[PDB]
Amino acid sequence: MKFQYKEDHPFEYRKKEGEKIRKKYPDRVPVIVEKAPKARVPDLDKRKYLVPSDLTVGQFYFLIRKRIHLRPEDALFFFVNNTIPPTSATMGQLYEDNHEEDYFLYVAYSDESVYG
């Protein structure tokens, strides 16, 4: 359900960061990535990313699996607004379709294909 990034920054303080980062990094999008509560996978050390718009979701997936040190036998799934995104979409398209009002895209991850 709830992202800790959203309880730490007032909507005003995270939207400030979001608006100013879209102009400064015009070929990347701002993405928060957090572990689903019941996930049996390691916590991610950094939650805030500037992701190239042209990188695919599948490529982003491989990057995140590496950052949490998954073995190849470990499953991982992403959830964006309660749905699992297709690996062929670009992160720019995923952002355009799913960013919240603070201009951030929120991605949760889990080892199972069910969230919350």
Binding site: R28, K48, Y49, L50
Partner: peptide
């Protein structure tokens, strides 16, 4: 709060 800037 800072960002982790990825390459392409």
């Amino acid at each position: 709060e800072d960002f982790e800037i990825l390459s392409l």
